[model samples]
Target: MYVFRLYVRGETHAAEVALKNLHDLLSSALKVPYTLKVVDVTKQPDLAEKDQVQATPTLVRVYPQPVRRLVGQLDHRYRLQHLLSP
Candidate 1:
Protein backbone atom coordinates (compact mmCIF):
# COMPACT_ATOMS: atom_id res chain seq x y z
CA MET A 1 0.00 0.00 0.00
CA TYR A 2 1.01 3.59 -0.58
CA VAL A 3 0.09 6.75 1.27
CA PHE A 4 0.43 10.22 -0.18
CA ARG A 5 -0.10 13.69 1.23
CA LEU A 6 -0.55 16.79 -0.88
CA TYR A 7 -0.02 20.19 0.72
CA VAL A 8 -1.48 23.29 -0.81
CA ARG A 9 -2.02 26.86 0.31
CA GLY A 10 -5.63 27.22 -0.77
CA GLU A 11 -8.19 26.65 -3.50
CA THR A 12 -6.21 28.59 -6.03
CA HIS A 13 -5.73 27.69 -9.69
CA ALA A 14 -2.28 26.29 -9.06
CA ALA A 15 -3.49 24.15 -6.17
CA GLU A 16 -6.44 22.80 -8.18
CA VAL A 17 -4.22 22.00 -11.12
CA ALA A 18 -1.79 20.24 -8.89
CA LEU A 19 -4.54 18.16 -7.33
CA LYS A 20 -5.99 17.21 -10.71
CA ASN A 21 -2.66 16.37 -12.21
CA LEU A 22 -1.68 14.29 -9.20
CA HIS A 23 -4.94 12.37 -9.32
CA ASP A 24 -4.46 11.57 -13.01
CA LEU A 25 -0.89 10.49 -12.49
CA LEU A 26 -1.63 8.27 -9.51
CA SER A 27 -4.65 6.63 -11.11
CA SER A 28 -2.73 5.64 -14.22
CA ALA A 29 0.89 5.36 -13.10
CA LEU A 30 0.70 3.82 -9.66
CA LYS A 31 0.51 0.06 -9.79
CA VAL A 32 -0.51 -0.43 -6.17
CA PRO A 33 -3.45 0.76 -4.08
CA TYR A 34 -2.83 4.16 -2.60
CA THR A 35 -4.36 6.69 -0.24
CA LEU A 36 -4.13 10.43 -0.78
CA LYS A 37 -4.66 13.19 1.79
CA VAL A 38 -4.96 16.78 0.77
CA VAL A 39 -3.81 19.37 3.28
CA ASP A 40 -4.76 23.01 2.93
CA VAL A 41 -2.55 25.49 4.70
CA THR A 42 -5.26 28.07 4.76
CA LYS A 43 -7.40 25.86 6.99
CA GLN A 44 -4.83 23.56 8.50
CA PRO A 45 -1.73 25.53 9.17
CA ASP A 46 -0.75 23.26 12.00
CA LEU A 47 -0.70 20.20 9.80
CA ALA A 48 1.28 22.03 7.17
CA GLU A 49 3.78 23.11 9.75
CA LYS A 50 3.98 19.62 11.14
CA ASP A 51 4.91 18.35 7.71
CA GLN A 52 7.33 21.25 7.34
CA VAL A 53 5.70 22.21 4.07
CA GLN A 54 7.28 25.28 2.52
CA ALA A 55 5.68 25.26 -0.91
CA THR A 56 2.14 25.59 -2.23
CA PRO A 57 2.12 22.21 -3.92
CA THR A 58 4.06 19.56 -2.11
CA LEU A 59 3.72 15.83 -2.58
CA VAL A 60 4.86 13.51 0.18
CA ARG A 61 5.00 9.74 0.18
CA VAL A 62 4.40 8.84 3.81
CA TYR A 63 4.11 5.09 3.66
CA PRO A 64 6.67 2.35 3.10
CA GLN A 65 10.29 2.70 4.05
CA PRO A 66 12.54 5.49 2.93
CA VAL A 67 10.02 8.30 2.74
CA ARG A 68 10.09 10.60 -0.29
CA ARG A 69 8.83 14.11 -0.92
CA LEU A 70 8.45 16.27 -3.97
CA VAL A 71 7.53 19.89 -4.52
CA GLY A 72 5.15 20.79 -7.30
CA GLN A 73 2.07 19.43 -9.14
CA LEU A 74 4.41 16.66 -10.18
CA ASP A 75 3.64 17.49 -13.82
CA HIS A 76 6.21 14.97 -14.99
CA ARG A 77 4.75 11.48 -14.97
CA TYR A 78 8.12 9.80 -15.07
CA ARG A 79 9.38 11.68 -12.07
CA LEU A 80 6.30 11.03 -9.97
CA GLN A 81 6.39 7.37 -11.02
CA HIS A 82 9.94 7.13 -9.84
CA LEU A 83 8.93 8.30 -6.42
CA LEU A 84 5.89 6.02 -6.10
CA SER A 85 7.13 2.87 -7.78
CA PRO A 86 9.00 0.14 -6.01
Candidate 2:
Protein backbone atom coordinates (compact mmCIF):
# COMPACT_ATOMS: atom_id res chain seq x y z
CA MET A 1 0.00 0.00 0.00
CA TYR A 2 1.07 3.55 -0.63
CA VAL A 3 1.44 5.90 2.32
CA PHE A 4 0.35 9.48 1.75
CA ARG A 5 0.60 12.25 4.29
CA LEU A 6 -1.25 15.54 4.08
CA TYR A 7 -0.15 18.42 6.29
CA VAL A 8 -2.76 21.08 6.72
CA ARG A 9 -3.45 23.99 8.99
CA GLY A 10 -6.65 24.50 11.02
CA GLU A 11 -10.16 24.96 9.74
CA THR A 12 -9.88 27.40 6.89
CA HIS A 13 -11.38 27.84 3.45
CA ALA A 14 -8.09 27.18 1.72
CA ALA A 15 -7.50 24.00 3.70
CA GLU A 16 -11.01 22.77 2.94
CA VAL A 17 -10.57 23.38 -0.75
CA ALA A 18 -7.21 21.68 -0.84
CA LEU A 19 -8.51 18.61 0.98
CA LYS A 20 -11.48 18.30 -1.36
CA ASN A 21 -9.23 18.47 -4.39
CA LEU A 22 -6.75 15.96 -3.02
CA HIS A 23 -9.48 13.55 -1.94
CA ASP A 24 -11.03 13.59 -5.39
CA LEU A 25 -7.71 13.31 -7.17
CA LEU A 26 -6.50 10.32 -5.20
CA SER A 27 -9.82 8.51 -5.30
CA SER A 28 -10.19 8.96 -9.04
CA ALA A 29 -6.67 8.58 -10.41
CA LEU A 30 -4.96 5.93 -8.35
CA LYS A 31 -5.48 2.40 -9.60
CA VAL A 32 -4.23 0.82 -6.43
CA PRO A 33 -5.43 1.38 -2.89
CA TYR A 34 -3.60 3.99 -0.84
CA THR A 35 -3.60 5.14 2.75
CA LEU A 36 -3.92 8.81 3.58
CA LYS A 37 -2.98 10.38 6.88
CA VAL A 38 -4.11 13.94 7.40
CA VAL A 39 -2.25 15.95 10.00
CA ASP A 40 -3.56 19.23 11.31
CA VAL A 41 -0.58 21.49 11.91
CA THR A 42 -2.56 23.54 14.37
CA LYS A 43 -2.76 20.47 16.60
CA GLN A 44 0.47 18.81 15.56
CA PRO A 45 3.03 21.56 15.14
CA ASP A 46 5.91 19.19 15.78
CA LEU A 47 4.96 17.08 12.79
CA ALA A 48 5.35 20.04 10.52
CA GLU A 49 8.84 20.73 11.86
CA LYS A 50 9.79 17.08 11.61
CA ASP A 51 8.59 16.84 8.00
CA GLN A 52 10.10 20.19 7.09
CA VAL A 53 6.74 21.41 5.97
CA GLN A 54 7.08 25.05 5.09
CA ALA A 55 3.55 25.55 3.87
CA THR A 56 0.04 24.32 4.39
CA PRO A 57 -1.59 21.67 2.19
CA THR A 58 1.60 19.71 1.74
CA LEU A 59 1.28 16.23 0.29
CA VAL A 60 4.00 13.70 1.03
CA ARG A 61 4.13 10.34 -0.68
CA VAL A 62 6.04 7.92 1.45
CA TYR A 63 6.71 4.28 0.61
CA PRO A 64 6.99 2.24 -2.60
CA GLN A 65 10.43 3.79 -3.22
CA PRO A 66 11.59 7.32 -3.94
CA VAL A 67 9.59 9.41 -1.46
CA ARG A 68 8.22 12.62 -2.94
CA ARG A 69 6.45 15.78 -1.83
CA LEU A 70 4.03 18.17 -3.50
CA VAL A 71 2.73 21.36 -2.00
CA GLY A 72 -0.58 23.15 -2.64
CA GLN A 73 -3.84 21.74 -3.94
CA LEU A 74 -2.27 19.47 -6.58
CA ASP A 75 -5.10 20.14 -9.05
CA HIS A 76 -3.25 18.95 -12.12
CA ARG A 77 -3.89 15.30 -12.81
CA TYR A 78 -1.02 14.72 -15.23
CA ARG A 79 1.57 16.06 -12.85
CA LEU A 80 0.14 14.24 -9.83
CA GLN A 81 -0.22 10.92 -11.63
CA HIS A 82 3.29 11.14 -13.00
CA LEU A 83 4.69 12.00 -9.60
CA LEU A 84 2.94 9.14 -7.81
CA SER A 85 3.13 6.43 -10.44
CA PRO A 86 6.35 4.47 -10.67
Candidate 3:
Protein backbone atom coordinates (compact mmCIF):
# COMPACT_ATOMS: atom_id res chain seq x y z
CA MET A 1 0.00 0.00 0.00
CA TYR A 2 1.15 3.52 -0.76
CA VAL A 3 0.74 6.24 1.86
CA PHE A 4 0.82 9.93 1.06
CA ARG A 5 1.08 12.68 3.64
CA LEU A 6 -0.18 15.97 2.21
CA TYR A 7 0.66 19.14 4.15
CA VAL A 8 -1.65 22.00 3.33
CA ARG A 9 -1.84 25.55 4.68
CA GLY A 10 -5.47 26.40 5.40
CA GLU A 11 -8.37 26.43 2.93
CA THR A 12 -6.95 28.57 0.22
CA HIS A 13 -8.04 28.19 -3.42
CA ALA A 14 -4.60 26.97 -4.36
CA ALA A 15 -4.75 24.27 -1.75
CA GLU A 16 -8.13 23.11 -3.00
CA VAL A 17 -7.02 23.07 -6.63
CA ALA A 18 -3.81 21.29 -5.69
CA LEU A 19 -5.70 18.68 -3.67
CA LYS A 20 -8.09 18.04 -6.55
CA ASN A 21 -5.19 17.47 -8.88
CA LEU A 22 -3.56 15.12 -6.41
CA HIS A 23 -6.79 13.24 -5.86
CA ASP A 24 -7.23 12.78 -9.60
CA LEU A 25 -3.70 11.53 -9.90
CA LEU A 26 -4.24 8.96 -7.18
CA SER A 27 -7.64 7.74 -8.32
CA SER A 28 -6.95 7.61 -12.00
CA ALA A 29 -6.43 4.63 -14.30
CA LEU A 30 -3.26 3.73 -12.43
CA LYS A 31 -5.53 1.92 -9.94
CA VAL A 32 -3.37 1.29 -6.93
CA PRO A 33 -4.02 0.94 -3.23
CA TYR A 34 -3.08 4.24 -1.66
CA THR A 35 -3.85 6.47 1.26
CA LEU A 36 -3.84 10.25 1.46
CA LYS A 37 -3.48 12.09 4.75
CA VAL A 38 -3.95 15.85 4.59
CA VAL A 39 -2.41 17.97 7.32
CA ASP A 40 -3.73 21.48 7.87
CA VAL A 41 -1.09 23.91 9.06
CA THR A 42 -3.60 26.56 10.01
CA LYS A 43 -4.61 24.74 13.17
CA GLN A 44 -1.36 22.82 13.64
CA PRO A 45 1.52 25.15 12.95
CA ASP A 46 4.09 22.95 14.72
CA LEU A 47 4.08 20.40 11.90
CA ALA A 48 5.07 23.04 9.39
CA GLU A 49 8.02 24.19 11.51
CA LYS A 50 9.24 20.64 12.10
CA ASP A 51 8.96 19.68 8.44
CA GLN A 52 10.44 22.90 7.08
CA VAL A 53 7.26 23.26 5.08
CA GLN A 54 7.56 26.52 3.17
CA ALA A 55 5.50 24.95 0.39
CA THR A 56 1.77 24.85 0.96
CA PRO A 57 0.88 21.67 -0.96
CA THR A 58 3.67 19.40 0.09
CA LEU A 59 3.25 15.64 -0.23
CA VAL A 60 5.27 12.98 1.53
CA ARG A 61 5.26 9.40 0.30
CA VAL A 62 5.82 7.32 3.43
CA TYR A 63 5.15 3.77 2.35
CA PRO A 64 7.14 1.45 0.04
CA GLN A 65 10.24 2.25 2.07
CA PRO A 66 12.90 4.78 1.13
CA VAL A 67 10.28 7.49 1.49
CA ARG A 68 9.86 10.37 -0.95
CA ARG A 69 8.48 13.90 -0.79
CA LEU A 70 7.34 16.58 -3.24
CA VAL A 71 6.50 20.24 -2.81
CA GLY A 72 3.88 21.77 -5.09
CA GLN A 73 0.90 20.51 -7.16
CA LEU A 74 3.02 18.04 -9.18
CA ASP A 75 2.13 19.69 -12.48
CA HIS A 76 2.45 16.63 -14.71
CA ARG A 77 0.43 13.43 -14.57
CA TYR A 78 2.74 11.23 -16.65
CA ARG A 79 5.62 12.36 -14.50
CA LEU A 80 3.70 11.36 -11.41
CA GLN A 81 3.11 7.84 -12.76
CA HIS A 82 6.76 7.38 -13.56
CA LEU A 83 7.83 8.50 -10.12
CA LEU A 84 5.29 6.43 -8.23
CA SER A 85 5.54 3.26 -10.25
CA PRO A 86 7.53 0.40 -8.77
Candidate 4:
Protein backbone atom coordinates (compact mmCIF):
# COMPACT_ATOMS: atom_id res chain seq x y z
CA MET A 1 0.00 0.00 0.00
CA TYR A 2 1.04 3.60 -0.55
CA VAL A 3 0.97 6.06 2.34
CA PHE A 4 1.00 9.78 1.64
CA ARG A 5 1.16 12.81 3.90
CA LEU A 6 0.03 16.25 2.74
CA TYR A 7 1.15 19.20 4.82
CA VAL A 8 -0.65 22.50 4.47
CA ARG A 9 -0.82 25.80 6.27
CA GLY A 10 -4.43 25.65 7.37
CA GLU A 11 -7.34 26.77 5.17
CA THR A 12 -5.49 28.84 2.70
CA HIS A 13 -6.01 29.04 -1.05
CA ALA A 14 -2.83 27.16 -1.82
CA ALA A 15 -3.79 24.45 0.62
CA GLU A 16 -7.21 24.03 -0.99
CA VAL A 17 -5.78 23.78 -4.45
CA ALA A 18 -3.17 21.30 -3.35
CA LEU A 19 -5.69 19.10 -1.61
CA LYS A 20 -8.06 19.03 -4.60
CA ASN A 21 -5.32 18.33 -7.09
CA LEU A 22 -3.82 15.64 -4.89
CA HIS A 23 -7.13 13.87 -4.61
CA ASP A 24 -7.66 13.98 -8.35
CA LEU A 25 -4.15 12.74 -9.09
CA LEU A 26 -4.31 9.88 -6.63
CA SER A 27 -7.79 8.87 -7.63
CA SER A 28 -7.05 8.74 -11.33
CA ALA A 29 -3.41 7.67 -11.34
CA LEU A 30 -3.14 4.88 -8.78
CA LYS A 31 -4.70 1.49 -9.27
CA VAL A 32 -3.43 0.06 -6.03
CA PRO A 33 -4.69 0.96 -2.57
CA TYR A 34 -3.33 4.04 -0.82
CA THR A 35 -3.72 6.22 2.23
CA LEU A 36 -3.58 10.00 2.43
CA LYS A 37 -3.09 11.93 5.64
CA VAL A 38 -3.59 15.69 5.62
CA VAL A 39 -1.69 17.66 8.21
CA ASP A 40 -2.67 21.18 9.18
CA VAL A 41 0.49 23.04 10.04
CA THR A 42 -1.24 26.01 11.57
CA LYS A 43 -2.89 23.90 14.22
CA GLN A 44 0.05 21.57 14.72
CA PRO A 45 3.30 23.23 13.88
CA ASP A 46 5.24 20.53 15.70
CA LEU A 47 4.15 17.90 13.22
CA ALA A 48 5.27 19.98 10.29
CA GLU A 49 8.51 20.88 12.05
CA LYS A 50 9.24 17.23 12.75
CA ASP A 51 9.12 16.53 9.04
CA GLN A 52 11.14 19.66 8.34
CA VAL A 53 8.28 21.00 6.25
CA GLN A 54 9.31 24.55 5.43
CA ALA A 55 6.66 25.31 2.84
CA THR A 56 2.93 25.04 2.62
CA PRO A 57 1.27 22.50 0.29
CA THR A 58 3.82 19.74 0.55
CA LEU A 59 3.43 16.11 -0.32
CA VAL A 60 5.36 13.32 1.38
CA ARG A 61 5.46 9.66 0.58
CA VAL A 62 5.90 8.20 4.03
CA TYR A 63 5.85 4.47 3.36
CA PRO A 64 7.45 2.17 0.77
CA GLN A 65 10.88 3.22 1.98
CA PRO A 66 13.31 5.71 0.50
CA VAL A 67 10.86 8.42 1.40
CA ARG A 68 10.27 11.34 -0.95
CA ARG A 69 8.74 14.78 -0.76
CA LEU A 70 7.18 17.21 -3.25
CA VAL A 71 6.66 20.76 -2.11
CA GLY A 72 4.31 23.05 -3.97
CA GLN A 73 0.72 23.22 -5.17
CA LEU A 74 1.38 19.76 -6.68
CA ASP A 75 0.96 21.09 -10.19
CA HIS A 76 3.08 18.40 -11.78
CA ARG A 77 0.82 15.43 -12.25
CA TYR A 78 3.26 13.51 -14.43
CA ARG A 79 6.03 14.02 -11.92
CA LEU A 80 3.82 12.55 -9.24
CA GLN A 81 3.27 9.53 -11.50
CA HIS A 82 6.99 8.92 -11.40
CA LEU A 83 7.11 9.56 -7.66
CA LEU A 84 4.42 6.96 -7.02
CA SER A 85 5.89 4.44 -9.41
CA PRO A 86 7.00 1.01 -8.22
Candidate 5:
Protein backbone atom coordinates (compact mmCIF):
# COMPACT_ATOMS: atom_id res chain seq x y z
CA MET A 1 0.00 0.00 0.00
CA TYR A 2 1.03 3.57 -0.63
CA VAL A 3 0.30 6.62 1.47
CA PHE A 4 0.08 9.98 -0.23
CA ARG A 5 -0.44 13.49 1.03
CA LEU A 6 -1.30 15.96 -1.67
CA TYR A 7 -0.79 19.63 -0.86
CA VAL A 8 -2.38 22.38 -2.87
CA ARG A 9 -2.87 26.12 -2.74
CA GLY A 10 -6.66 25.86 -2.95
CA GLU A 11 -8.74 26.17 -6.12
CA THR A 12 -6.20 27.22 -8.68
CA HIS A 13 -5.85 25.47 -12.05
CA ALA A 14 -2.62 23.74 -11.06
CA ALA A 15 -4.25 22.48 -7.89
CA GLU A 16 -7.29 21.22 -9.77
CA VAL A 17 -5.25 19.56 -12.47
CA ALA A 18 -2.91 17.85 -10.05
CA LEU A 19 -5.81 16.63 -7.93
CA LYS A 20 -7.62 15.33 -10.97
CA ASN A 21 -4.50 13.64 -12.27
CA LEU A 22 -4.05 11.91 -8.93
CA HIS A 23 -7.63 10.73 -8.95
CA ASP A 24 -7.28 9.32 -12.42
CA LEU A 25 -4.11 7.45 -11.51
CA LEU A 26 -5.58 6.02 -8.33
CA SER A 27 -8.82 5.08 -9.99
CA SER A 28 -7.35 3.21 -12.92
CA ALA A 29 -3.65 2.57 -12.49
CA LEU A 30 -2.44 1.77 -9.02
CA LYS A 31 -3.03 -1.80 -7.88
CA VAL A 32 -2.23 -1.60 -4.22
CA PRO A 33 -4.24 -0.09 -1.39
CA TYR A 34 -3.59 3.63 -1.14
CA THR A 35 -4.52 6.46 1.13
CA LEU A 36 -4.64 9.95 -0.32
CA LYS A 37 -5.13 13.01 1.85
CA VAL A 38 -5.66 16.25 0.03
CA VAL A 39 -4.60 19.32 1.97
CA ASP A 40 -5.34 22.85 0.87
CA VAL A 41 -2.62 25.13 2.21
CA THR A 42 -4.93 28.10 1.95
CA LYS A 43 -7.21 26.46 4.51
CA GLN A 44 -4.60 24.65 6.60
CA PRO A 45 -1.35 26.45 6.90
CA ASP A 46 -0.02 24.26 9.70
CA LEU A 47 -0.18 21.13 7.62
CA ALA A 48 1.60 22.93 4.86
CA GLU A 49 4.28 24.11 7.26
CA LYS A 50 4.68 20.64 8.73
CA ASP A 51 5.29 19.29 5.27
CA GLN A 52 7.60 22.19 4.52
CA VAL A 53 5.71 23.05 1.40
CA GLN A 54 7.42 25.63 -0.78
CA ALA A 55 5.23 25.01 -3.77
CA THR A 56 1.65 24.27 -4.67
CA PRO A 57 0.66 20.97 -6.28
CA THR A 58 3.07 18.93 -4.24
CA LEU A 59 2.64 15.20 -3.71
CA VAL A 60 4.34 13.59 -0.75
CA ARG A 61 4.67 9.85 -0.39
CA VAL A 62 4.55 9.25 3.32
CA TYR A 63 4.75 5.53 3.78
CA PRO A 64 6.37 2.25 2.82
CA GLN A 65 9.72 3.75 3.62
CA PRO A 66 11.97 6.21 1.75
CA VAL A 67 9.49 9.06 1.54
CA ARG A 68 9.31 11.01 -1.70
CA ARG A 69 7.65 13.96 -3.42
CA LEU A 70 6.67 15.20 -6.86
CA VAL A 71 6.30 18.90 -7.41
CA GLY A 72 5.11 21.12 -10.26
CA GLN A 73 3.88 20.03 -13.67
CA LEU A 74 3.28 16.28 -13.15
CA ASP A 75 3.68 16.29 -16.88
CA HIS A 76 4.12 12.56 -17.29
CA ARG A 77 2.24 10.02 -15.25
CA TYR A 78 4.33 7.07 -16.32
CA ARG A 79 7.55 8.52 -15.04
CA LEU A 80 5.88 9.42 -11.78
CA GLN A 81 4.70 5.85 -11.34
CA HIS A 82 8.19 4.56 -12.05
CA LEU A 83 9.57 6.92 -9.44
CA LEU A 84 7.04 5.61 -6.95
CA SER A 85 7.72 2.00 -7.70
CA PRO A 86 9.62 -0.13 -5.27
Candidate 6:
Protein backbone atom coordinates (compact mmCIF):
# COMPACT_ATOMS: atom_id res chain seq x y z
CA MET A 1 0.00 0.00 0.00
CA TYR A 2 1.03 3.58 -0.63
CA VAL A 3 0.67 6.37 1.89
CA PHE A 4 0.47 10.07 1.09
CA ARG A 5 0.61 12.93 3.54
CA LEU A 6 -0.65 16.32 2.46
CA TYR A 7 0.36 19.28 4.58
CA VAL A 8 -1.67 22.44 4.07
CA ARG A 9 -2.14 25.82 5.67
CA GLY A 10 -5.55 27.28 6.40
CA GLU A 11 -7.55 29.47 4.00
CA THR A 12 -4.74 29.81 1.49
CA HIS A 13 -5.66 30.07 -2.19
CA ALA A 14 -2.73 27.89 -3.20
CA ALA A 15 -3.78 25.24 -0.73
CA GLU A 16 -7.29 25.26 -2.16
CA VAL A 17 -5.98 24.82 -5.67
CA ALA A 18 -3.68 22.03 -4.54
CA LEU A 19 -6.55 20.20 -2.92
CA LYS A 20 -8.63 20.36 -6.07
CA ASN A 21 -5.78 19.02 -8.16
CA LEU A 22 -5.01 16.30 -5.63
CA HIS A 23 -8.63 15.19 -5.59
CA ASP A 24 -8.73 14.96 -9.35
CA LEU A 25 -5.43 13.12 -9.62
CA LEU A 26 -6.21 10.64 -6.89
CA SER A 27 -9.72 9.95 -8.16
CA SER A 28 -8.96 9.81 -11.86
CA ALA A 29 -5.37 8.72 -12.36
CA LEU A 30 -4.27 6.41 -9.59
CA LYS A 31 -4.90 2.79 -10.38
CA VAL A 32 -4.09 1.46 -6.94
CA PRO A 33 -5.86 2.24 -3.68
CA TYR A 34 -3.75 4.52 -1.51
CA THR A 35 -4.17 6.11 1.88
CA LEU A 36 -4.24 9.90 1.96
CA LYS A 37 -3.89 11.86 5.17
CA VAL A 38 -4.44 15.60 5.25
CA VAL A 39 -2.82 17.63 7.98
CA ASP A 40 -3.41 21.28 8.79
CA VAL A 41 -0.18 22.83 10.01
CA THR A 42 -2.08 25.50 11.91
CA LYS A 43 -3.77 22.83 13.99
CA GLN A 44 -0.94 20.30 14.01
CA PRO A 45 2.32 22.14 14.16
CA ASP A 46 4.10 19.12 15.61
CA LEU A 47 3.31 17.10 12.52
CA ALA A 48 4.94 19.66 10.31
CA GLU A 49 8.16 19.42 12.26
CA LYS A 50 8.00 15.65 12.34
CA ASP A 51 7.69 15.47 8.58
CA GLN A 52 10.09 18.35 8.00
CA VAL A 53 7.47 20.12 5.98
CA GLN A 54 8.83 23.47 4.87
CA ALA A 55 5.92 24.85 2.83
CA THR A 56 2.20 24.72 2.43
CA PRO A 57 0.59 22.30 -0.02
CA THR A 58 3.38 19.76 0.23
CA LEU A 59 2.86 16.16 -0.75
CA VAL A 60 4.98 13.49 0.94
CA ARG A 61 5.17 9.86 0.13
CA VAL A 62 5.56 8.30 3.55
CA TYR A 63 5.53 4.63 2.74
CA PRO A 64 6.98 2.34 0.09
CA GLN A 65 10.51 2.53 -1.30
CA PRO A 66 12.64 5.63 -1.59
CA VAL A 67 10.31 7.95 0.29
CA ARG A 68 10.07 11.33 -1.41
CA ARG A 69 8.36 14.70 -1.27
CA LEU A 70 6.90 17.07 -3.85
CA VAL A 71 6.14 20.64 -2.90
CA GLY A 72 3.34 22.68 -4.42
CA GLN A 73 0.18 21.82 -6.34
CA LEU A 74 0.68 18.93 -8.74
CA ASP A 75 -1.36 20.37 -11.63
CA HIS A 76 0.56 18.83 -14.48
CA ARG A 77 -0.33 15.24 -15.28
CA TYR A 78 3.16 14.30 -16.47
CA ARG A 79 4.85 15.59 -13.39
CA LEU A 80 2.34 14.01 -11.05
CA GLN A 81 2.53 10.64 -12.76
CA HIS A 82 6.32 10.66 -12.80
CA LEU A 83 6.37 11.36 -9.08
CA LEU A 84 3.93 8.54 -8.32
CA SER A 85 5.42 5.87 -10.52
CA PRO A 86 8.33 3.70 -9.53
**Candidate that would win on lDDT:** 4
lDDT assessment of candidate 3: 0.72
Return the TM-score for candidate 2, rounded to 2 decimals. 0.73
TM per candidate comes to: 0.72, 0.73, 0.72, 0.73, 0.68, 0.69
Per-residue alpha-carbon lDDT of candidate 1 for residues 1-86, written as tens digits (9 for 90 to 100):
66777887867886788688987787787566777887877787687777776655777778675477777545456667667666
Q: Worst lDDT window (10 residues) for model 1? A: 72-81
The Cα error of candidate 3 at residue 60, in Å, is 0.8
For candidate 2, lDDT tens digit of each residue in 1-86? 67787778788787777777877788887777778877887787687777776656788878875588776555456666666577
What's model 4's lDDT at 65?
Answer: 68
> Which portions of model 5 miss their true places by more than 4 Å?
26-29, 78-82
TM-score of candidate 1 relative to the true fold: 0.72
Record all residue pairs in model 4 with backbone atoms less than 3 Å apart, i.e. clashing. Answer: none
The lowest-lDDT stretch of 10 consecutive residues in candidate 2 is 71-80
Q: State the C-alpha lDDT per candidate.
A: 0.73, 0.74, 0.72, 0.75, 0.73, 0.73
lDDT of 5 at 51: 71
Which residue runs does candidate 1 get wrong by more than 4 Å? 72-86
Q: In terms of TM-score, how similar is model 3 to the real structure? A: 0.72
Runs off by more than 4 Å, candidate 4: 76-82
lDDT (Cα) of model 5: 0.73
lDDT of 4 at 9: 84
Q: Model 1, 71: alpha-carbon shift in Å?
A: 2.7
